[PDB]
Amino acid sequence: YIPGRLDGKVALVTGSGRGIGAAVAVHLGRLGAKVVVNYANSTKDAEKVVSEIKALGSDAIAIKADIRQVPEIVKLFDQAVAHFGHLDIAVSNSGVVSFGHLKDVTEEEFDRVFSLNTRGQFFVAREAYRHLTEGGRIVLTSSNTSKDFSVPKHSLYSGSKGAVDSFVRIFSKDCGDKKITVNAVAPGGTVTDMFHEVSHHYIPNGTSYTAEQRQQMAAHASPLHRNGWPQDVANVVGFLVSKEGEWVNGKVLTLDGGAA
Amino acid sequence: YIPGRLDGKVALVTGSGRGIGAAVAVHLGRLGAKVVVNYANSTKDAEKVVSEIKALGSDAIAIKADIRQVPEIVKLFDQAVAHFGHLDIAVSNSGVVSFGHLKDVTEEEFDRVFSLNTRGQFFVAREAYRHLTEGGRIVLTSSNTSKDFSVPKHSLYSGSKGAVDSFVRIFSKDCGDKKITVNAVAPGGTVTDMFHEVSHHYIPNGTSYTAEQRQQMAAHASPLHRNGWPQDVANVVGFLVSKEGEWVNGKVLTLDGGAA
Ligand SMILES: NC(=O)c1ccc[n+]([C@@H]2O[C@H](COP(=O)([O-])OP(=O)(O)OC[C@H]3O[C@@H](n4cnc5c(N)ncnc54)[C@H](OP(=O)(O)O)[C@@H]3O)[C@@H](O)[C@H]2O)c1
Numbered sequence A, B: 001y002i003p004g005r006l007d008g009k010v011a012l013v014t015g016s017g018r019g020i021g022a023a024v025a026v027h028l029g030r031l032g033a034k035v036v037v038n039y040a041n042s043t044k045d046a047e048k049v050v051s052e053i054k055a056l057g058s059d060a061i062a063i064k065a066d067i068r069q070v071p072e073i074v075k076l077f078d079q080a081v082a083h084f085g086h087l088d089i090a091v092s093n094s095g096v097v098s099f100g101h102l103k104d105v106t107e108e109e110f111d112r113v114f115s116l117n118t119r120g121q122f123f124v125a126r127e128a129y130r131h132l133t134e135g136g137r138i139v140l141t142s143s144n145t146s147k148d149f150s151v152p153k154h155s156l157y158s159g160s161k162g163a164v165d166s167f168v169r170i171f172s173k174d175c176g177d178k179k180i181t182v183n184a185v186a187p188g189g190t191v192t193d194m195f196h197e198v199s200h201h202y203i204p205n206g207t208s209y210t211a212e213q214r215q216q217m218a219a220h221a222s223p224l225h226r227n228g229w230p231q232d233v234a235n236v237v238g239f240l241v242s243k244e245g246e247w248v249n250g251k252v253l254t255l256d257g258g259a260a
């Protein structure tokens, strides 16, 4: 039993077919956990992550569930436990980004973002609490924009993740009766499909720079002069879900390489 | 020199038939503003607040609108402006509280709380931005539980108000193009109808004390050894919405008499 390792444990990661979730899933597998790879649309990518986790010597299964639908969350966790027998670690990663001036945010856009980023994560946590073994781990995903980084026209998203920050602090109090810790990671700009989709909103006149230039400017936001990568987030989740992370509980760790 | 008056201004307060909203509405009237008193159910109480504002020498009208319904928000603001000619100040105060261990929180309870506390306030802000005159003021309502105070079985509510904290910081960036400031007040335990919902949870072992004892214990949580009252919040909103409050922008002010 090596320190920081997860041998014999079972982890579930939402939205782990690609992006940050994919890194987290492969990493938990690398640490020796068996992994449930949840996806909503990226079936082939989820299979690739599963194949990669098996190739590094662990086991994994891909399970489709739309995390906007609470009954599908319940089913996801039921299927997870049915397959591996038990569940120790739940990482809630699924999310969507949005931009718009307050004046033009519609009801439908509010609901598209909150239903996944906030409502979905809340019920992923609920189901995690119900299904997890004593001494388990829950990690939710927030963002540096919730508290540390203020971007015009980003109010909906920033708020969606501000709620998650508050959740984890109080979740840790409730989840303590099963000795489960609850934390969140709040990444800054991390190079994924989402990054490239929206990097132009984070930069003044972002549209008149190339996509590569925009990534390079995000690199210079950190005093380390490099971009955040999915592995950066995965490294921290892996520590939080280990035995050694136990005393970190009820906290949000901003992961922006010192940009804030 | 008389600081902080609002003569010639028009203010709208959601949920101002009773509680904190009532005190805010009466106070804005005391400062010289004309006031739109929104309520959802408390018709008679809204009439009492209107009467009180007229007694103080200002003018007011009560308008029914369910702030969960975005079309009713739009109408509320349209009617406000049609009646008084313009609108300068919007205070979003309507909210409900909730308690429950994470394991027992249902979809319906999530939606009951978020639809008013987070979604409702978000669209009150949107409509406020659209309808306010240049140089106006928006104030939303959060809670000490979002960031400063951690209460078991209070995750849903704490998160509903954490989202608001994030909103106001970014709202201030968007609203700056009409020179409108946006802030929130985050009260601690303030003696209203809601206080009776919260008091047994905000006091250690609150369940083994009388309601009067709980209020006394809540008083001893402040180093000033008294309870928070609606007027305490009203005093701060009044300053934030005055000319003199301008440089407070994008902030959440916790109002707990030094308990945090
Ligand atoms: N990347 C950044 O710079 C950054 C910064 C701060 C915070 N974050 C947060 O980090 C998390 C992941 O972001 P990312 O960069 O990996 O974004 P991404 O590349 O767009 O990936 C999004 C992930 O969310 C999943 N997803 C989308 N809709 C879903 C649904 N309805 N049900 C279940 N899963 C769904 C997607 O799975 P499918 O493709 O199968 O739908 C995918 O796995 C999000 O919570 C995001 O808010 C990202």
Ligand SMILES: NC(=O)c1ccc[n+]([C@@H]2O[C@H](COP(=O)([O-])OP(=O)(O)OC[C@H]3O[C@@H](n4cnc5c(N)ncnc54)[C@H](OP(=O)(O)O)[C@@H]3O)[C@@H](O)[C@H]2O)c1
Binding pocket: B014, B015, B016, B017, B018, B019, B020, B021, B039, B040, B041, B042, B043, B065, B066, B067, B068, B093, B094, B095, B096, B097, B116, B141, B142, B143, B144, B186, B187, B188, B189, B190, B191, B192, B193, B194, B195, B198
């Ligand atoms: N009191 C506390 O210790 C405390 C502490 C922290 C934060 N807060 C926040 O302070 C704000 C004021 O609360 P309070 O203490 O005054 O609570 P309260 O006595 O329960 O008053 C609730 C107010 O919300 C209004 N409201 C409820 N549902 C509504 C709806 N659908 N549409 C429009 N208005 C609605 C109610 O009006 P109707 O009767 O007409 O429905 C009433 O005016 C809330 O946002 C609350 O979260 C209160």
Ligand SMILES: O=c1c(O)c(-c2ccccc2)oc2cc(O)ccc12
Binding pocket: A097, A143, A144, A145, A187, A188, A189, A190, A194, A195, A196, A198, A199, A200, A202, A203, A214, A215, A217, A218, A221
């Ligand atoms: O997609 C993002 C992004 O491109 C960037 C970004 C891109 C270029 C410069 C600075 C930031 O930041 C983010 C921060 C977040 O909390 C979430 C997403 C992004």
